[PDB]
Amino acid sequence: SAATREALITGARKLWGLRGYAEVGTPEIATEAGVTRGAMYHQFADKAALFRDVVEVVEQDVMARMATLVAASGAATPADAIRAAVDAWLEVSGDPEVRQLILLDAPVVLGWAGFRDVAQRYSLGMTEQLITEAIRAGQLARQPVRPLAQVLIGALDEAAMFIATADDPKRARRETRQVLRRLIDGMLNG
Amino acid sequence: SAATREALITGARKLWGLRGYAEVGTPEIATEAGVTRGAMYHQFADKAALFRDVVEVVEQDVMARMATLVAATPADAIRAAVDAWLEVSGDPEVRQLILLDAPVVLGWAGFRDVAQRYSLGMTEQLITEAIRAGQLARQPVRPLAQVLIGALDEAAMFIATADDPKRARRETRQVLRRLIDGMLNG
Ligand SMILES: O=C(CCC(F)(F)F)N1CCC2(CC1)CC(c1ccccc1)=NO2
Ligand SMILES: O=C(CCC(F)(F)F)N1CCC2(CC1)CC(c1ccccc1)=NO2
């Protein structure tokens, strides 16, 4: 039953990641997972409840992958870490599974309140940390941390959404990246 | 029947603006508007369809109010547009219908679609003129517009639900002024 929970999250994540929430039902997910409908329904009351758990694990991975790519950049100063985090988010957003589940399905299925709540829970802390360190190093002017975090999260989430539905995503990714890099380079002292 | 549409949009806008979408039903709106439920349902199949039309009219007005406040260099217009948006988003009716109810009722796809349809043109124009005047580096116009709209919408949402909106408006204003002053040349 713990095993059943895990198999259901993994199967849902894989299938919904490829085909989207709308295109795969709970019976096909149960078959994929090798469990009965009665065991599925004991763990998840409906389609949407399984999807909320798929979103948590995917967002968990998005954040761990973000932290990995910033560490991998070899950013010495906070300013460079900030530059590396921007690039990392555009990299990770571009992953087809992240695009489908987080950018496209999640806002529709969780609704706005649910989606914002999740997106804040996973993003705010990293965002505030990067800012706080840049301020401590003197690479960013002292200013209210939470409001700047919030503004950057809005800018970066919107970037990702814009690329996700672009006629030409490779162009939109490059252009949006340049525009973010310029904005950041005008804010940062170093 | 255009008249019935107008009466219904005004009544909806007034009542939902005071009490919020969730707290007022369509029958009370029909009574407010001076029409029968049958005439309302001929024009709007449900609650949400009336709300989409309330959003259009309100956003139309938000944009005209924005253009009015700016017209009262391109770089300064950009700074004035930021102030103007914080001014007009602070309006209780705009706060309730556009910042709070619209993303819930339209969804994010619908909300972004509306917000871009009304905002993009002004946003692209301000950018383009700042580029022409040499106050902003030449760079892709649509992607910058898009990023600014996201930042500014999120600013307004942050203020709209702040524990202390007067504090959050001042702090967020400073943070937006800094962001903008880094985007602009001088
Ligand atoms: O998980 C999300 C969003 C999930 C969504 F559901 F809303 F779409 N992220 C966006 C913002 C972050 C974290 C990843 C923070 C960040 C950063 C970069 C530079 C300086 C400060 C923060 N890069 O991306
Ligand atoms: O209509 C909206 C949002 C409506 C909502 F539905 F999303 F809530 N606005 C935000 C963007 C604008 C217009 C107001 C454009 C703008 C600006 C400022 C500086 C340089 C360039 C553009 N400031 O506010």
CA-wise closest residue to B158 among A150, A114, A117: A150
For residue A77, the SS3 value is coil
Residue B101 Cβ contacting ligand 2 at under 6 Å? no
What is the four-CA torsion angle of B67, B71, B76, B79, rounded to 10 degrees? Answer: -40
Q: Cα of B174 to ligand 2 centre, how many Å?
A: 17
B100 lines ligand 2 (CB under 6 A): no
Q: Hunting for tokens 């309100």 — which residue is that?
A: B58
The interaxial angle of helices B47-71 and B74-90, nearest 10 deg, is 140
With CB atoms and an 8 Å threshold, state whether A178 touches B153: no
Question: In what helix (H) or strand (E) does residue A123 lie, and over which residues does it extend?
Answer: helix A106-136
A138, A57, A96, A162: which is closest to B142 by C-alpha? A162
**B133: its two tokens:** 């005047």
Taking the CA of residue B151 and the nearest CA in chain A, the distance in Å comes to 4
Resolution limit in angstroms? Answer: 2.4
Token reading at B162: 């702040």
Residue with tokens 């391109």: B74
Of B69, B59, B108, residue with least CA distance to A154: B108
Q: To test the ligand 1 pocket, which listed residue (A127, A176, A179, A184) has its Cβ within 8 A of the most ligand atoms?
A: A127
- Tokens encoding A109: 């299925």
Determine the distance in angstroms separating the CA of B176 from the nearest CA of chain A, rounded to an integer: 8
- Write out the two tokens for B20: 């919020």
Experimental method: X-ray
Distance in Å, alpha carbon of B79 to nearest chain A alpha carbon: 15
SS3 A127: helix
Q: Are B1 and B43 in contact (CB under 8 A)?
A: yes
Nearest to A155 by CA among B118, B152, B9: B152
| Count: domains in chain A | 1
Residue whose CB lies within 8 A of the most ligand 2 atoms, among B116, B123, B180, B183, for a mutation test: B123
Q: Which of B122, B127, B104 is nearest to B55 (CA)?
A: B104
CB B171 within 8 A of CB A148: no
Q: What angle do CA A162, A168, A169 make, to 5 degrees?
A: 50
d(CA B11, CA B31): 9
Q: Which spans in chain B are helix H?
A: 2-19, 26-33, 37-43, 47-71, 74-90, 92-94, 102-132, 141-160, 165-183
CB contact at 8 A, B108 and B90: no
Identify which of B98, B108, B37 has the alpha carbon closest to the alpha carbon of residue B66: B98
- The amino acid present at B96, given as its one-letter code, is Q
Q: Whose CA is nearest to atom 1 of ligand 1?
A: A123
Interface of B with A (CB under 8 A): 103-104, 107-109, 111-112, 137, 139-140, 142-144, 146-155, 157-158, 168, 171-172, 174-176, 178-179, 181-184
3-state DSSP percent of chain A in helix, strand and coil, to 5: 85, 0, 15
Burial B161-177 (b: 16+ CB within 10 A, else e): ebeeeeebbebbbebbe
Distance linking the first and last C-alpha atoms of chain A: 53
Alpha carbons within 13 angstroms on the beta-carbon side of residue B62 total 28
The CA distance from B127 to B75, in Å, is 9
> Distances in Å between the alpha carbon of A89 and those of A17, A35, A116, A157, A189?
18, 36, 17, 9, 22
**Rounded Cα–Cα distance for residues A69 and A67 (Å):** 6
CB A178 within 8 A of CB B140: yes
Report the distance separating Cα A70 and Cα A84, nearest Å.
5
**The two three-digit tokens of residue A134, written as one number:** 């840049």
Q: Which range of residues forms the domain containing residue B138?
A: 1-186
For an interface test with A, give the residue of B85, B116, B119, B147 to mutate (most A CBs within 10 A). B147
Closest by alpha carbon to B108, among A107, A20, A119, A118? A107
